[PDB]
């Protein structure tokens, strides 16, 4: 994707049109932004495609001769359409020469010309102009017909071809061998093949017609250029490499700053991710401001890189626009230096200059079109290989023999077999078994042997590698496959039912099924009972859209489906293996009735149900070991005996004892992220209001974009004035000619500087707003109550990506893309005004036609009416049927319904197809109007222009007529691409609405607050009739009047069942949540009165699983505290009391080793003691212990528990323990049961009562 758009961007770089230079620069920045960039800042490539490509002639096979002719007709007509603009260049030269001449006549009182002395009468001018006017009229009607034929022909053939390609592919894929589906064992194969089926259509449609059109515009565009002046063309083409180098300069800058900016914010992205993920930890350790500082330092670094991006984009885009007009200047300077010599005609100079532009523009338009053909040849291969190109060895559609009437005598003889995939491990090795007509034979054995493969070889899914399998004496390889499948019924372990009604699934059992026939088989399979009990009965849909039936219910319908055709040979492959014990009963009762009256081969997991089989065949390592009924094999003490007794023992022992999901683009997500919240989407003004602090940069940027806007209307004056030089001059073509040619150098310098100042300063305003919103939003998030983080929308990753992509998404509506729209709007107003200033009669006529011209440009964009979402939605329905057939090929191939699924796909394709060819005509008509409306303007402007000169007074002068035309046509050159801002703006309005609303949400329990009582704690913790419920589950109350008191230095212990309320004591005291009744007093003061930040620093926590941050152990211990507060000696002193000094000091680098790097290298016992080290450095007045030991009351438990008691010495403590053993040594203990304490006392005292 990225390698293509990079080469396409160079093709656009060679375009000499001034509006294209703006267009090609805007598109280059898009190439290195969201969705086009990976995680490192690099461009996406190769991943989104096939290695081998199909021939273009081969690609267009399946087209009738009539359509192949339509393809030929449409191609020739396309070359004519492309030859239109170069043909206009000759007409533009002739009419300008005619107009410039009549001016000399008016300047010289109505006479004859200087060259050759031609009396240029009113009729000489009238004949010249009407000749041009009639030509533009001929092209207006002509190019509409030329345009409509090109598109209608190409889209009609593209639809007619792909409609045949779709059905011929499904026709072929269901007839493939099962072995092929083993090699292509991917479940996404069907969906990927249909994704390719669409990509072939995209690159064989009208896009090829367009490719030929832009191809001939490059050729005829330069032919006309070279045949009029081979010198000026070389002069002009010599300046393009300097312009292309500036184009490369944009691509080089935007790519290197995309990598540098993503790497610099990657550091900030890790800060926001690791702290929100464990916010309860960072809040407890009191280091929110430390993190707020790190993220601010990192975002400032990303801003510095972002402002520098605008500087390099400013010089690049500024230079490219400047070198563009230098190409004009240099051509005009040598142009007068050729007309004065008499070597070059003026009209031919106007033609050659216009022709080169049409040619250079064509190159950048051809590239994108040829590329779609390239991906069309690729995607086709995967389809083609399957598509009749490979003759499958197991053809589901052939002729073997049908004459025989089957009794049911099966004979497996010396059958050796190995699956094609994994051909190294054999499965069957000389198996010999016999099944007589009517017998209900059973295959028993271990997992190794292939009892189940016998069924696969009887259905002929795979061929016998050595040996033979015969039905009624005839080898299966000789019998007709379709006939074989119709006579042999299968009931596999996992039943496959298609997305249709119950009776429709059963009907797939027989060709001419009757309702009476179905119920008879449905009652036999014990399914009639539950079907009547559910709504719609048989007419109910069973599948994805319908009701989800039970596994045992689904199997009984499958049993019924196998019975409807009334088979002579029926196979049961562990049909009761994937069912629960309660549901297995009815199914087996149904399998028994189904087996009676025919020959049946049963593969069973439960050997109890295999007891009364007519014959039991035991398999081992792919061969038969014993054959005989239950009585015989049990008397032999063979493999069967071993299996039965072993199983029946396990059965007796058990009976006595017991009896990534979603992925899409930015626009869609931001619509759902606006949802979930109150998020009222923002507008442009609101976003500017937030960018108020950067109003200076924003003002300079928009002011320099307004002055920059006046450059197109003046370029209009600078060009018509250069023409006016040739309008009657006593060899003054040099004095005035070299002046205007050099005036384009001034113009180039004017736009170069204006363009630089625009992108750079709007770059500061946008990147600064990004920084401002980032620091503002993260401070808002860290100051939240923690009940905030319990909400789904406030997930660690959802907030992280909002600061990563959504804030820079808001940026795109304020950077240089927004600035250029202002530039385009100003030129459009100034130009139209300047046009009226020169002549209102001419101006008003042109403007009256412009809405028709714009409408034609609108239709060239391809969008008709509003959207295409409903048109291509009907194609998905046909896909769903075909995908389901490929997902369940084994089932459709066994029921021989592979032919019926093909017809159901075709019938569902008929609706979308009939509408599509109807659409090809409408779409063609649309392009006819699109590619002919430009000639409609010229045929009217020159007709109205002539009528204003041919008048008696006269009303308007020849040159003044042209100054009006070029004032509008040049000033509205940039308007077509100006509409590319609105999709980016709409995307930014969603992002802003979320972010600005997120900032409006203030905390209920404001951390980072400087307000409240900042007191020195002692330890008097008191809970008084405390009632609490979690914010996400407000109704269900966890604490129901918890009351207790803890004195300084005293330790209380909370013990009880799970979900009683003892777990919330550590949270409420650290103020993670507020009480819903009752107060919590800490040293006399109620907890709500205290300043959170100041009291949390005097409280420490050691949890069950303590999380450590990505840093050194030294820094991980003193995480909260500032560097210039605690000495290194205090850290080691804290480590020696926590029993870690030996682990770290006697370890390389000491405490400077990276802990928590890609998981923790240290054990759960080491982490728990580093958590004790954290608590000791900053001597806590109270210390919260919540499930302190996660060492499973074993060896690692005694080492860490002894260290815990060395800490809770001079400080008060509260221990919450799930294990009642480690509770002893506490000054008091309490038992919580329903959110209230029942009994209190000491270990000794509490033990007395029972
Ligand atoms: C190219 O442009 C026009 C074509 O319409 C043409 O203009 C002529 O201008 C003259 C001078 O102003 C006009 O006036 C007179 O026309 C009559 C009838 O044609 C002539 O008889 C006149 O000629 C002379 O007659 C006498 C002969 O000696 C003189 O005494 C007297 O002074 C005149 O000079 C005179 O031209 C005239 O109406 C038009 N021409 C015509 C044919 O009507 C101009 O001449 C053309 N240029 C060239 C080089 O062909
Ligand atoms: C409802 C009647 C509307 C009439 C008002 C017209 C207002 C001025 C023209 C606005 C529409 S023209 C615009 O012109 C662009 C260029 O022709 C179209 O973009 C297409 O062509 C571009 C080439 O410049 C490609 O870059 C772009 O990928 C493609 O979508 C857009 O789809 C198309 O919307
Ligand atoms: C009251 C006020 C009414 C205002 C109405 C404004 C209507 C403006 C219509 C703009 C149509 S888009 C315009 O279409 C023009 C062709 O119709 C484009 O002109 C360029 O491309 C042409 C080839 O299609 C060249 O002939 C032309 O030289 C070039 O400038 C421009 O690049 C492209 O921006």
PDB file of N, CA and C in Angstrom, residues 632-669:
ATOM      1  N   UNK A 632     -18.284 -63.523  22.838  1.00  0.00           N
ATOM      2  CA  UNK A 632     -17.053 -64.114  22.345  1.00  0.00           C
ATOM      3  C   UNK A 632     -15.778 -63.363  22.728  1.00  0.00           C
ATOM      4  N   UNK A 633     -15.785 -62.053  22.527  1.00  0.00           N
ATOM      5  CA  UNK A 633     -14.612 -61.250  22.810  1.00  0.00           C
ATOM      6  C   UNK A 633     -14.332 -61.096  24.299  1.00  0.00           C
ATOM      7  N   UNK A 634     -15.374 -61.181  25.127  1.00  0.00           N
ATOM      8  CA  UNK A 634     -15.179 -61.048  26.565  1.00  0.00           C
ATOM      9  C   UNK A 634     -14.557 -62.330  27.097  1.00  0.00           C
ATOM     10  N   UNK A 635     -14.793 -63.430  26.395  1.00  0.00           N
ATOM     11  CA  UNK A 635     -14.255 -64.721  26.799  1.00  0.00           C
ATOM     12  C   UNK A 635     -12.809 -64.935  26.336  1.00  0.00           C
ATOM     13  N   UNK A 636     -12.307 -64.005  25.526  1.00  0.00           N
ATOM     14  CA  UNK A 636     -10.944 -64.080  24.984  1.00  0.00           C
ATOM     15  C   UNK A 636      -9.919 -63.236  25.749  1.00  0.00           C
ATOM     16  N   UNK A 637     -10.419 -62.297  26.560  1.00  0.00           N
ATOM     17  CA  UNK A 637      -9.593 -61.374  27.343  1.00  0.00           C
ATOM     18  C   UNK A 637      -8.683 -60.572  26.425  1.00  0.00           C
ATOM     19  N   UNK A 638      -9.258 -60.129  25.308  1.00  0.00           N
ATOM     20  CA  UNK A 638      -8.513 -59.373  24.320  1.00  0.00           C
ATOM     21  C   UNK A 638      -8.500 -57.880  24.556  1.00  0.00           C
ATOM     22  N   UNK A 639      -8.489 -57.109  23.470  1.00  0.00           N
ATOM     23  CA  UNK A 639      -8.471 -55.654  23.557  1.00  0.00           C
ATOM     24  C   UNK A 639      -9.836 -55.138  23.989  1.00  0.00           C
ATOM     25  N   UNK A 640     -10.897 -55.750  23.463  1.00  0.00           N
ATOM     26  CA  UNK A 640     -12.262 -55.355  23.795  1.00  0.00           C
ATOM     27  C   UNK A 640     -12.535 -55.568  25.271  1.00  0.00           C
ATOM     28  N   UNK A 641     -12.106 -56.721  25.786  1.00  0.00           N
ATOM     29  CA  UNK A 641     -12.289 -57.061  27.200  1.00  0.00           C
ATOM     30  C   UNK A 641     -11.575 -56.009  28.069  1.00  0.00           C
ATOM     31  N   UNK A 642     -10.360 -55.655  27.669  1.00  0.00           N
ATOM     32  CA  UNK A 642      -9.581 -54.678  28.403  1.00  0.00           C
ATOM     33  C   UNK A 642     -10.259 -53.323  28.426  1.00  0.00           C
ATOM     34  N   UNK A 643     -10.838 -52.937  27.298  1.00  0.00           N
ATOM     35  CA  UNK A 643     -11.504 -51.642  27.187  1.00  0.00           C
ATOM     36  C   UNK A 643     -12.807 -51.581  27.972  1.00  0.00           C
ATOM     37  N   UNK A 644     -13.594 -52.650  27.910  1.00  0.00           N
ATOM     38  CA  UNK A 644     -14.872 -52.696  28.615  1.00  0.00           C
ATOM     39  C   UNK A 644     -14.698 -52.642  30.133  1.00  0.00           C
ATOM     40  N   UNK A 645     -13.862 -53.527  30.661  1.00  0.00           N
ATOM     41  CA  UNK A 645     -13.633 -53.591  32.096  1.00  0.00           C
ATOM     42  C   UNK A 645     -12.931 -52.354  32.653  1.00  0.00           C
ATOM     43  N   UNK A 646     -12.045 -51.756  31.870  1.00  0.00           N
ATOM     44  CA  UNK A 646     -11.337 -50.571  32.320  1.00  0.00           C
ATOM     45  C   UNK A 646     -12.306 -49.408  32.420  1.00  0.00           C
ATOM     46  N   UNK A 647     -13.176 -49.298  31.417  1.00  0.00           N
ATOM     47  CA  UNK A 647     -14.166 -48.225  31.341  1.00  0.00           C
ATOM     48  C   UNK A 647     -15.227 -48.405  32.403  1.00  0.00           C
ATOM     49  N   UNK A 648     -15.754 -49.622  32.522  1.00  0.00           N
ATOM     50  CA  UNK A 648     -16.797 -49.901  33.495  1.00  0.00           C
ATOM     51  C   UNK A 648     -16.315 -49.690  34.934  1.00  0.00           C
ATOM     52  N   UNK A 649     -15.002 -49.673  35.132  1.00  0.00           N
ATOM     53  CA  UNK A 649     -14.451 -49.443  36.460  1.00  0.00           C
ATOM     54  C   UNK A 649     -14.472 -47.940  36.712  1.00  0.00           C
ATOM     55  N   UNK A 650     -13.979 -47.164  35.746  1.00  0.00           N
ATOM     56  CA  UNK A 650     -13.928 -45.713  35.892  1.00  0.00           C
ATOM     57  C   UNK A 650     -15.333 -45.194  36.076  1.00  0.00           C
ATOM     58  N   UNK A 651     -16.271 -45.816  35.371  1.00  0.00           N
ATOM     59  CA  UNK A 651     -17.681 -45.444  35.449  1.00  0.00           C
ATOM     60  C   UNK A 651     -18.224 -45.691  36.860  1.00  0.00           C
ATOM     61  N   UNK A 652     -17.829 -46.811  37.464  1.00  0.00           N
ATOM     62  CA  UNK A 652     -18.285 -47.178  38.807  1.00  0.00           C
ATOM     63  C   UNK A 652     -17.686 -46.301  39.919  1.00  0.00           C
ATOM     64  N   UNK A 653     -16.451 -45.851  39.715  1.00  0.00           N
ATOM     65  CA  UNK A 653     -15.764 -44.995  40.676  1.00  0.00           C
ATOM     66  C   UNK A 653     -16.355 -43.584  40.641  1.00  0.00           C
ATOM     67  N   UNK A 654     -16.625 -43.085  39.438  1.00  0.00           N
ATOM     68  CA  UNK A 654     -17.204 -41.751  39.257  1.00  0.00           C
ATOM     69  C   UNK A 654     -18.689 -41.676  39.638  1.00  0.00           C
ATOM     70  N   UNK A 655     -19.417 -42.769  39.428  1.00  0.00           N
ATOM     71  CA  UNK A 655     -20.843 -42.826  39.752  1.00  0.00           C
ATOM     72  C   UNK A 655     -21.067 -42.906  41.276  1.00  0.00           C
ATOM     73  N   UNK A 656     -20.145 -43.552  41.987  1.00  0.00           N
ATOM     74  CA  UNK A 656     -20.261 -43.682  43.434  1.00  0.00           C
ATOM     75  C   UNK A 656     -19.879 -42.370  44.121  1.00  0.00           C
ATOM     76  N   UNK A 657     -18.843 -41.709  43.602  1.00  0.00           N
ATOM     77  CA  UNK A 657     -18.356 -40.437  44.144  1.00  0.00           C
ATOM     78  C   UNK A 657     -19.285 -39.245  43.844  1.00  0.00           C
ATOM     79  N   UNK A 658     -19.867 -39.242  42.647  1.00  0.00           N
ATOM     80  CA  UNK A 658     -20.755 -38.166  42.198  1.00  0.00           C
ATOM     81  C   UNK A 658     -22.093 -38.638  41.591  1.00  0.00           C
ATOM     82  N   UNK A 659     -22.968 -39.187  42.438  1.00  0.00           N
ATOM     83  CA  UNK A 659     -24.269 -39.673  41.997  1.00  0.00           C
ATOM     84  C   UNK A 659     -24.788 -40.858  42.793  1.00  0.00           C
ATOM     85  N   UNK A 660      -8.855  -7.939  19.684  1.00  0.00           N
ATOM     86  CA  UNK A 660      -8.743  -9.144  18.870  1.00  0.00           C
ATOM     87  C   UNK A 660     -10.059  -9.470  18.164  1.00  0.00           C
ATOM     88  N   UNK A 661     -11.182  -9.229  18.844  1.00  0.00           N
ATOM     89  CA  UNK A 661     -12.518  -9.504  18.296  1.00  0.00           C
ATOM     90  C   UNK A 661     -13.005  -8.477  17.260  1.00  0.00           C
ATOM     91  N   UNK A 662     -12.715  -7.197  17.498  1.00  0.00           N
ATOM     92  CA  UNK A 662     -13.131  -6.116  16.598  1.00  0.00           C
ATOM     93  C   UNK A 662     -11.979  -5.231  16.120  1.00  0.00           C
ATOM     94  N   UNK A 663     -12.079  -4.781  14.871  1.00  0.00           N
ATOM     95  CA  UNK A 663     -11.063  -3.924  14.283  1.00  0.00           C
ATOM     96  C   UNK A 663     -11.562  -3.142  13.078  1.00  0.00           C
ATOM     97  N   UNK A 664     -11.463  -1.815  13.150  1.00  0.00           N
ATOM     98  CA  UNK A 664     -11.885  -0.943  12.058  1.00  0.00           C
ATOM     99  C   UNK A 664     -11.145   0.407  12.104  1.00  0.00           C
ATOM    100  N   UNK A 665     -11.455   1.294  11.153  1.00  0.00           N
ATOM    101  CA  UNK A 665     -10.821   2.619  11.058  1.00  0.00           C
ATOM    102  C   UNK A 665     -11.234   3.625  12.156  1.00  0.00           C
ATOM    103  N   UNK A 666     -10.706   4.849  12.062  1.00  0.00           N
ATOM    104  CA  UNK A 666     -10.970   5.902  13.046  1.00  0.00           C
ATOM    105  C   UNK A 666     -12.378   6.515  13.058  1.00  0.00           C
ATOM    106  N   UNK A 667     -12.923   6.814  11.882  1.00  0.00           N
ATOM    107  CA  UNK A 667     -14.245   7.434  11.759  1.00  0.00           C
ATOM    108  C   UNK A 667     -15.406   6.685  12.409  1.00  0.00           C
ATOM    109  N   UNK A 668     -15.392   5.359  12.304  1.00  0.00           N
ATOM    110  CA  UNK A 668     -16.448   4.523  12.867  1.00  0.00           C
ATOM    111  C   UNK A 668     -16.375   4.451  14.391  1.00  0.00           C
ATOM    112  N   UNK A 669     -15.158   4.278  14.905  1.00  0.00           N
ATOM    113  CA  UNK A 669     -14.911   4.192  16.340  1.00  0.00           C
ATOM    114  C   UNK A 669     -15.317   5.472  17.049  1.00  0.00           C
TER     115      UNK A 669
END
